[PDB]
Amino acid sequence: SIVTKSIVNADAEARYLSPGELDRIKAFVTGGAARLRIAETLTGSRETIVKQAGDRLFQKRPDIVSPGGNAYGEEMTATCLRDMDYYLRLVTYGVVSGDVTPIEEIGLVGVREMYRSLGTPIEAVAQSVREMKEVASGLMSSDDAAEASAYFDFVIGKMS
Amino acid sequence: SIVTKSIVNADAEARYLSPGELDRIKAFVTGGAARLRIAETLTGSRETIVKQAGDRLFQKRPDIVSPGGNAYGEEMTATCLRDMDYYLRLVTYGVVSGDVTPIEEIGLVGVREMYRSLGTPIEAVAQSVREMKEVASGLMSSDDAAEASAYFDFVIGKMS
Amino acid sequence: SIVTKSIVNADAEARYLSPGELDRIKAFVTGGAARLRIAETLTGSRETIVKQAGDRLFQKRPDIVSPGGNAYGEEMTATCLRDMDYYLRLVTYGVVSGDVTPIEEIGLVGVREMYRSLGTPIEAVAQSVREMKEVASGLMSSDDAAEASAYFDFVIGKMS
């Protein structure tokens, strides 16, 4: 949240927020309603975003769901969708916050270590998020999609 | 080599090498003949090591040599074989020096940044080095292969 | 000890012990009986090693055992031979451990402060250890003497 960042910056310099900072917070709260609508769109279509993304993912990476694959079987496949659900949920946190901080703090610091330990092909996790971005884009206007894609793109960059 | 590492350790304490460090150096120079044997083996079989490794990798990863793949086409696939030869040459350097330092300094610092810039799937590079390890370990005795494995593994580990 | 020394070197780098370190440890344990024999030799002839070396020292440095010398008088002379006994025992600790840290931690850290406080001429102490190295060397074969000499030379090199 720009509000937390500004206070962190201001207190690190032991000063009141500058007029420029307060103006940014003002613009941030005014644009809140548009941010909340985008979050509502993604939140409403959560189940179809994940399901269609997972089907798209398995179409182009069949190995991960075939025998021997990390996601082979029903249970492991659901866990893979569960992980995709996690990242979609973090994207909504970031959309509302207007910032990637909730995304990074919750689901990206050390993500590489986690998936290496689990033997999950990280490049396929990045693909799954790409799949969720394409699906979600087709549920909202072009401007709304472009705003939401920055958060999807942030996840994808951190998985590569 | 272990000579520089010992000196650097001794110079941090502004002291002479202790008897234990000198004994380790003496053992290192005695085993030099065995180190040179392995490096000669890899050097003499380098063309066959890379060629077979490339075939093995491409069967495992047809996408990289398919349309849209980073190594697609004769010109790109030859360049990919050249990189495998580079890392084989680095592993030879690690063998004779008994340490991975020459490998780290020539080919593993910033390696992710370079390949990400080129669009090269780093996991496919890591796989290629695994293939070279397999082929190479078949041209030498169990002990010699075990010796050389540490350097092959180091490259793989730094490419995760 | 050789094991502790390599462990602290490996811990300082947050890594498992390297093959080179593990091979040095393997050789040390497998040559263990040869070292203990040298320590047994030094231990059993400690009376004659200290007495003869002490007799030589006072011939080499008669001032220390003259009026105004630190070791003047039978009682001070006894403490000087005691000190030589201390350092001989430490040499045997170093021999069986394959490392100088037992010597360093017991009798070389702060040795300059201790002997300057007492008024003892430290370089004469280096001479006394030097004298013990000849007497000890003449009680064993050249290869055994070389192994013990390294630790004698470490004590000599530190006080001097």
Place this chain on the structure above:
Amino acid sequence: SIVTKSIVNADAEARYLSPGELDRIKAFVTGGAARLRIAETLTGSRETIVKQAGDRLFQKRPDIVSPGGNAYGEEMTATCLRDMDYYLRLVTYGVVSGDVTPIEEIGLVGVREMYRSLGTPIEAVAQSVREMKEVASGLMSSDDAAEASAYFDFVIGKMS
């Protein structure tokens, strides 16, 4: 005091007091009665010192007792004269102690923050110290007055 000033200075260097530091402590204790006399003079004449200094100050700075001025009105003038008595009491602490430590730690450390918050013009506080110095230096011999002046001047220099 001069004693604590020297001790703190030597302690920061992990050393005993130098010959010079002991010299000035010896001189300070030898001339103690002269300091106690100067201190006795100021205490007895404090009421006339402050009043005559207060009178002199307002004739040079009539603004501070004019409308809008910090000492405007009898009640604020009484507060201002109180502040002069504070700093007079501190000059006598300086003389007896032979060091300006009592002055600094009671009346100068952070003083600019205090008078800035209150709106008192600091250069006018310094002027009131000059006035007390003049009224004081006429109530004692030049040698006694000179010693007292040095401590008045210290405050004037730090406030200015």
Place this chain on the structure above:
Amino acid sequence: KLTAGNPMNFLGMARSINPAANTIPKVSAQNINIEASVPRR
């Protein structure tokens, strides 16, 4: 009673001095020509 440091202890002294406040000055920014009156050393 009054304790040490209490400004009341100097009210008598303040009245005795009876400092003279400057008369309310006759100044007006309207009448001042800024560019002409500022010194030019």
Place this chain on the structure above:
Amino acid sequence: NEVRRFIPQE
């Protein structure tokens, strides 16, 4: 113009 007092406020 205000006249400040030296009494504590109640």
Place this chain on the structure above:
Amino acid sequence: RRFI
């Protein structure tokens, strides 16, 4: 110098 005696240590006794």
Place this chain on the structure above:
Amino acid sequence: MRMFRITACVPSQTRIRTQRELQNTYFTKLVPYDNWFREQQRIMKMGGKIVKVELATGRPGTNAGLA
């Protein structure tokens, strides 16, 4: 006190930094005389190249009056 004015170029060895780093890479600084030996050793160990050394303050050969 005597002071050296030293110029040094200290490269980056084990990382590709992304912030601006010129200020800590090629710099000229004043070092107190009593810190130069230690500081010079440290720069050398970090791979730094000492490109210029000058006695900015003080005089060569002084026996008394080093401050």
Place this chain on the structure above:
Amino acid sequence: VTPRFVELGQVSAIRTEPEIAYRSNQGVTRQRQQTKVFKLVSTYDKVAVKNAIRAAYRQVFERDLEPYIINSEFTALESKLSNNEINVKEFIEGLGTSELYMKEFYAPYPNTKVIEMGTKHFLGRAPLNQKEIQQYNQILASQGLKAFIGAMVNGMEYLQTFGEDTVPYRRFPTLPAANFPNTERLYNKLTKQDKELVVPSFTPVVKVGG
């Protein structure tokens, strides 16, 4: 039926606000992220230079200097930093060797506590081990305060961590053992909160010679 992937991300049982508050603030403090690192990359911006300087005072002295100085004794030091004649590291050492620092964090405390406040201010952490406590105790015993500050700020650790251009800051070391909790106890106390040693000495596991 509820999709399986939804059930695999569900929280068992309802969570009350206490459980929520506890779970929201578990683990390492968010202060590790919610901070600013003052890295003086240029001297052209005097506002940034002044911001770095005032951060330096707050780091080394633990707060702004105004309420315990008469006049500033660091003005020439600020002039040198601002003129790019020194670096942040030299400015930081200049603060540690100042009379003000001696008054604040040397004279009131024994050398044992001077050590841990020293590493806190200049390295960002509690002392590592007994070897480090020994090493700085000899320096204090023989050369005094200025030598101790010079040792910390000119060491390899300082340069690798904070370098030449960065004001020191609170660290959250993972290794070695006890460094994190000791550093935490140092940085969770206000200035002059008490007169107690966080790390008087490391209890030895094996007494050499005893």
Place this chain on the structure above:
Amino acid sequence: MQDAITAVINSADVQGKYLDGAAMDKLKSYFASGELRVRAASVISANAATIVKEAVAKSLLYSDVTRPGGNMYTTRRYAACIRDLDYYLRYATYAMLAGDASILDERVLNGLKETYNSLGVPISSTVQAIQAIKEVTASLVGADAGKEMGVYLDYICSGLS
């Protein structure tokens, strides 16, 4: 620390929940309040020094606290005191902007009661001075913003006692 938005986000994340209707309401409420928060914050910063000056004048002047033997006696202690009041006003304004008192628990109150008992700082006098700061700020920012600052300045006061 957390602001109003991240409090909602973090409490949702702990429960593994997407932002439901109640969460969206809380976010909307903070967004609507945002304009009045930035205005009050800009006012306080322009008057920070004058607020503390007035609060001290009306609570901690011409009393035994500022006289010899009082905890504010000596210039260094007087400066430390008004420095402390400046802390509370600034951090209370941070919390007002954030709509969350957590920054106060983290960066103000942690160890404060212990520190004051160590140094003998009178907490009763301190809370009086904070209360005076509350009255003075309310007069400058307004009634609605004054109450918001009142919440957080009261939070500091209750954390001291």
Place this chain on the structure above:
Amino acid sequence: MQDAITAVINSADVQGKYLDGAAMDKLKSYFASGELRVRAASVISANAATIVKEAVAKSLLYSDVTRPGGNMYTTRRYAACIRDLDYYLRYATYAMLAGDASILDERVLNGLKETYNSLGVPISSTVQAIQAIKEVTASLVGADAGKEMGVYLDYICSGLS
């Protein structure tokens, strides 16, 4: 830190005695065990990542700790938990090689309880995980070496409990 050899030396030093026959027997016993310790150490180091992976799978995953709101939840905390397990295994390997647990008291356990209790790390869950690491490494290095590694991993667990 003290290994099996310096344990003999230290016991002689505190009495000011040269090493006698009994002391040489202890050194011989440790020298005879050297080959077993070295071989086990190399196998563990080459399998460290996989040892922890399987220990986590059977002891931590799909439980409260990994669900949202859990201590292992969030990628940072999961990664920190794996890193901690790597540390325990690596220091147990040091201890197993040294034949002495003193390294664990000095470089692992010192302040560990305080660290975990302040962070809210679940002590029982980490103990269960280490026990899983003990089981997994035993099936890799054999019963004799597995029981030797079990001593030093069990030493850590007893330190934490």
Place this chain on the structure above:
Amino acid sequence: MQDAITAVINSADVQGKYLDGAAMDKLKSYFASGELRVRAASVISANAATIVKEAVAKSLLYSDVTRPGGNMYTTRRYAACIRDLDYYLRYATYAMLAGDASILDERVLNGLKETYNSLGVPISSTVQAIQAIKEVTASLVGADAGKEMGVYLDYICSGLS
């Protein structure tokens, strides 16, 4: 740290009053002993190493404290004890010059017992060495000065038990 003069000045400032007759007599008393203290500090600083050396020789050498197993045993721990005695003499000299033991309370005794207890330093042996510092010092500064120095060397010993 406060010296005798500071205590008088602080005893009056806290009451906000000038130095009266009784305060002047306390200053006079200290001024009278200024030569006694300065002379003693001169000789002590001249013989600091000798005072510790002979205090150790008379108190700790040729005992179980320096023999194997004793806390002074090993060259490292010998130096540490010598360094500590140098502290106690230098700080006792500070206290003697200042006529006040505050510097001992602040710079010496604060946390000293915690330190020694964690390292296993024997208190009783440390007190004997300090008492031997006192007897050696008295024989060198005369009896009057050695009496004043004894007060502050006894103060350290008292603060250690």
Place this chain on the structure above:
Amino acid sequence: MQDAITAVINSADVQGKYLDGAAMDKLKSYFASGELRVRAASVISANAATIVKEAVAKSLLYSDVTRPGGNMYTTRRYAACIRDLDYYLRYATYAMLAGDASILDERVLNGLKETYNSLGVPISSTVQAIQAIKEVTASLVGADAGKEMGVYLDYICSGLS
């Protein structure tokens, strides 16, 4: 710094070629000299202080350099000179062990010539002292090792001009 092995590696790597027969020969020659270098290094470390003592007595003492007006006059500057020589010998020993002078370029001849010219240290006298170190070492390690140590001590001498 680079030892003899890493130097051969770097020569091949800069051309991007494998280690050929000539490069293998250089590696073989270095390996075969290893025991002799480690022997000489052990001798130098045991006599390092003595080596500098006798080199100074032979080249600097009782001359204009150590008399008033000489750069080595004053204990301050005498000790500074002794330190420099002590570092020269140790670094020449590293270079001999490594079989390559790169460490001398990086950790000795990196700003040293310009520091010496700034302070007025006489290079001529420094070179003579180093040459005396070379003479003293050869009398201790023999001729084959002494020639090798002379190569690197000469490297320092010519580095200083």
